[PDB]
Design a protein around this ligand. Structure first.
Ligand SMILES: *[C@@H]1O[C@H](CO)[C@@H](O[C@@H]2O[C@H](CO)[C@@H](O[C@@H]3O[C@H](CO)[C@@H](O)[C@H](O)[C@@H]3O)[C@H](O)[C@H]2NC(C)=O)[C@H](O)[C@H]1NC(C)=O
Ligand SMILES: *[C@@H]1O[C@H](CO)[C@@H](O)[C@H](O)[C@H]1NC(C)=O
Ligand SMILES: *[C@@H]1O[C@H](CO)[C@@H](O)[C@H](O)[C@H]1NC(C)=O
Ligand SMILES: *[C@@H]1O[C@H](CO)[C@@H](O)[C@H](O)[C@H]1NC(C)=O
Ligand SMILES: *[C@@H]1O[C@H](CO)[C@@H](O)[C@H](O)[C@H]1NC(C)=O
Lengths: 167, 566, 65
């Protein structure tokens, strides 16, 4: 009745080795958001904030616009301000999270829940958990959950699942 | 007034005094602790058997987390004084036994956990005076037999877990007086031969798991009173035969699973009164042939998946009552001499796999009634020829797949109806030359793929009526010259052919120099981070061979002045 | 009317809000009196099929030591 707990992985010199570490010159060097250990310089008061940008300066808070009627999307696309009858998918989500309840501790890169809308059908496109300023792999699917061919032009871990174009 | 050894928290929204004595090396309990506590954490320490007088003077509680540790004994009167307790956790200690009376001082309990302990031989009447319990967890222990009336007095129970144990027998009086149970779990035990009078007085059950046991018989009459029920599971077992009166009345059922069993034939009128299923699974069984009207009454299915039986022949009229069916797997069984007109009626499908079967040929009336399809697979059968009038019926279609067969030529009136294709895959065949005009009707196509064949020339008048290409592959095909007909391309693979670096091969040089991202040099293969250490690279090098003065060299870099008599 | 969020964006948002504390899938039973009685299904179902916002997300973080 309590389940496991998820917590970020303590990083070490290995992480700093893999993570290119050249902090440019500045004031108040801080850590990047989420849970990732690569030091950068902080933002001022009044510049755009988000989930994949840097974190605001000291004694500051990142809150969305005071209207917009859509907070979470507005924060996902980086538009904050630094201011002081089952279906084909429910049947999968069910026996997915019916397995993550008999274990002790785990890591946030081991959760694999799908992405499907409010009628049980897979949505358009699927992705994987990120690690702070570094997104994950993504691909395109169809209504019942079969992958489709596609390529990329900008780089890996990037795709635009359009109506049918997978550019 | 905190014992100066634990993190003392304070009021947040009520008078909680959450005391955090968790991750610290402790031996037996501290003293001088607050009296008005509302939650206490003690997990992780190295305690042992508790003293009888240990938790008095704490007439307010409701949280006694005690996981981890090295506890094994609960001496009598241990829980004396706790009248307002509401949760308890003893998960991973190494307990061994519980005497009678240990729960006489604590009514109003609402959850209990004894999961990864080491204990057997429950007594007869432990959980008495517990008319308010809601959960009970006993999985992963050494239980092997239960006396009658072991669960006596548990009126308002709603969940129950018996997994990882070693039960082998179920008498007809165990689940008696449990009129509000809601979920039962009996997986990973060693049961056999479900009897005929056990599940008769649980009129509110909703889930039932019998996953991995050794079951070889199911008496006719079981599952009789279970009106409300929505999830059966009998996957990994040894069921050897279904009778006609095995599921008589389970109206509200919605998910059956019968994979990986050893069923060897179906009967005339199984599967009736199941007007509301939406998923069946008969996986790696040994079904041999389908009689007429075997699936009858399942007028609302959605998924079938008969995917690795030894199915050798199907008679006309087998799939009869399946009206609203959308997906059928069928892929893996040797269906050699299939008859014709066998798919009639199913005009609501969307995807049909047929790979892995040993088909052989395609005759004019193989796929007839499927005027609703959208995806064909037909990958690795071994066809030697497809006839001219085979695909004149599939109006909607978005993907063909003929990857590893052995065709040698295509009739010149094959794609007459398919005016909506978007993916055409024809790899690894033995084609020798593509027809002269049989590409007109395709007007919405992109992503062509003809790699690994043995083509020999591509005329200019071949790719003109295709103004939507964005991808093209020609690896390892024995060509000599080529001029880019679609101007808005975005990919080109050209490695493996014996190019002739002369005058007519210059537009390719210009297009490759001015469009370097459409014709790359190499792209880095996929990587996931842990295996990013090695940088796997797929190549795309263009070579010169027919002229010996530029032999060996690449085309992108040769001289900048060889094209001066050109 | 209400918005909805499901998939891996949910996991990223949860990582962003809580931080280096952690999170559970059910409520951390703070002074359990009716937490079990009144059944809160879970964060996944509520935010994938009914409605979702920041207060509910904050309610599920682990408590600091
Ligand atoms: C229709 O049925 C076919 C039956 O073969 C399904 O294809 C199979 O899909 C499973 C997915 O678990 C493949 O298993 C995988 O095998 C590889 C090793 O080969 C292993 O590394 C993976 O962990 C996994 O076990 C299986 O190989 C594959 N069979 C074939 C054709 O190779 C197919 O998915 C079903 N399609 C549906 C349900 O729509
Ligand atoms: C508990 O003891 C171990 C070694 O016995 C020590 O490393 C650890 O620091 C101790 N815990 C604390 C909180 O000091
Ligand atoms: C509770 O109070 C009794 C009587 O005042 C006292 O002697 C004891 O130490 C306290 N705690 C325990 C261990 O019961
Ligand atoms: C090139 O095509 C031929 C024809 O089938 C094949 O035998 C050969 O293996 C292919 N090359 C490579 C590198 O696979
Ligand atoms: C292809 O060219 C690259 C240079 O771009 C070279 O390093 C590689 O060895 C070449 N591979 C082949 C197939 O010769």
């Amino acid at each position: 009745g309590l389940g496991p707990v998820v917590r970020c992985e303590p990083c070490d010199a290995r992480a700093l080795a893999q993570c290119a570490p050249p902090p440019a010159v500045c004031a108040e060097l801080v850590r990047e958001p989420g849970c990732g250990c690569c030091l950068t310089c902080a933002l001022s008061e009044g510049q755009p904030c988000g989930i994949y940008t840097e974190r605001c300066g000291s004694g500051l808070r990142c809150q969305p616009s005071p209207d917009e009627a859509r907070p979470l999307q507005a924060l996902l696309d980086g538009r904050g301000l630094c201011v002081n009858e089952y279906g084909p998918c429910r049947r999968e989500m069910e026996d997915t999270l019916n397995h993550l309840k008999f274990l002790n501790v785990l890591s946030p890169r081991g959760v694999h829940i799908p992405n499907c809308d409010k009628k049980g059908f897979y949505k358009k496109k699927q992705c994987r958990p990120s690690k702070g300023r570094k997104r994950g792999f993504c691909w395109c699917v169809d209504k019942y959950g079969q992958p489709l061919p596609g390529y990329t032009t900008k780089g890996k871990e990037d795709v635009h699942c359009y109506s049918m174009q997978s550019k | 007034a905190c014992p100066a050894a634990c993190v003392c928290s304070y009021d947040d929204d009520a008078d909680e005094l959450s005391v955090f004595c968790s991750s610290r090396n402790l031996t037996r309990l501290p003293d001088g602790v607050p009296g008005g506590t509302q939650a206490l954490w003690l997990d992780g320490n190295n305690l042992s058997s508790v003293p009888p007088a240990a938790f008095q003077n704490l007439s307010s509680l409701g949280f006694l987390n005690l996981q981890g540790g090295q506890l094994g004994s609960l001496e009598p009167q241990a829980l004396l004084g706790l009248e307002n307790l509401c949760h308890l956790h003893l998960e991973r200690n190494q307990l061994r036994s519980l005497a009678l009376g240990t729960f006489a001082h604590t009514p109003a309990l609402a959850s209990l956990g004894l999961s990864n302990n080491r204990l057997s031989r429950l007594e007869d009447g432990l959980f008495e005076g517990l008319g308010s319990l809601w959960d009970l967890n006993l999985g992963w222990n050494s239980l092997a037999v239960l006396p009658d009336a072991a669960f006596r007095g548990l009126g308002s129970l709603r969940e129950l877990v018996l997994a990882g144990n070693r039960l082998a027998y179920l008498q007809p009086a165990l689940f008696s007086g449990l009129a509000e149970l809601r979920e039962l779990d009996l997986s990973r035990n060693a049961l056999r031969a479900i009897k005929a009078n056990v599940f008769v007085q649980l009129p509110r059950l909703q889930k039932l798991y019998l996953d991995r046991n050794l079951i070889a018989a199911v008496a006719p009459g079981a599952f009789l009173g279970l009106k409300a029920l929505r999830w059966l599971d009998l996957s990994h077992n040894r069921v050897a035969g279904l009778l006609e009166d095995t599921f008589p009345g389970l109206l509200g059922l919605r998910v059956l699973r019968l994979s990986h069993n050893a069923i060897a034939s179906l009967r005339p009128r199984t599967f009736k009164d199941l007007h509301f299923l939406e998923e069946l699974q008969l996986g790696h069984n040994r079904i041999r042939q389908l009689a007429e009207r075997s699936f009858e009454g399942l007028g609302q299915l959605e998924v079938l998946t008969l995917d690795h039986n030894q199915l050798q022949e199907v008679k006309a009229g087998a799939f009869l009552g399946l009206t609203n069916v959308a997906v059928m797997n069928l892929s893996g069984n040797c269906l050699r001499n299939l008859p014709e007109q066998v798919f009639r009626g199913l005009g609501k499908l969307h995807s049909l796999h047929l790979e892995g079967s040993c088909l052989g040929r395609i005759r004019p009336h193989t796929f007839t009634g499927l005027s609703g399809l959208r995806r064909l697979f037909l990958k690795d059968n071994g066809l030697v020829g497809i006839e001219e009038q085979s695909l004149w019926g599939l109006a909607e279609l978005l993907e063909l797949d003929l990857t590893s067969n052995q065709l040698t030529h295509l009739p010149h009136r094959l794609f007459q109806g398919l005016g909506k294709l978007e993916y055409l895959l024809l790899s690894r065949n033995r084609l020798a030359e593509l027809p002269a005009d049989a590409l007109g009707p395709l007007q919405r196509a992109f992503w062509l793929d003809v790699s690994h064949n043995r083509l020999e020339a591509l005329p200019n008048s071949l790719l003109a009526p295709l103004g939507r290409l964005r991808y093209l592959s020609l690896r390892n095909n024995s060509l000599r010259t080529f001029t880019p007909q679609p101007p808005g391309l975005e990919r080109l693979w050209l490695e493996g052919n014996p190019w002739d670096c002369g005058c007519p091969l210059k537009a390719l040089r210009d297009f490759a120099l001015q469009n370097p991202s459409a014709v790359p040099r190499f792209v880095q293969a996929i990587c996931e981070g842990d295996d990013c250490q090695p940088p796997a690279y797929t190549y795309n090098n263009i070579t010169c061979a027919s002229p010996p003065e530029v032999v060996g060299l690449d085309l992108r870099d040769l001289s900048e002045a060889h094209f001066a008599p050109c | 009317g209400p918005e909805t969020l499901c998939g891996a964006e949910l996991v990223d948002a949860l990582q962003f809000v809580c931080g280096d504390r952690g999170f559970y899938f059910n409520k951390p039973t703070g002074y359990g009196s009716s937490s079990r009685r009144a059944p809160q299904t879970g964060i996944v179902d509520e935010c994938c099929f009914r409605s979702c916002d920041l207060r509910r997300l904050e309610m599920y973080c682990a408590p600091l030591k």
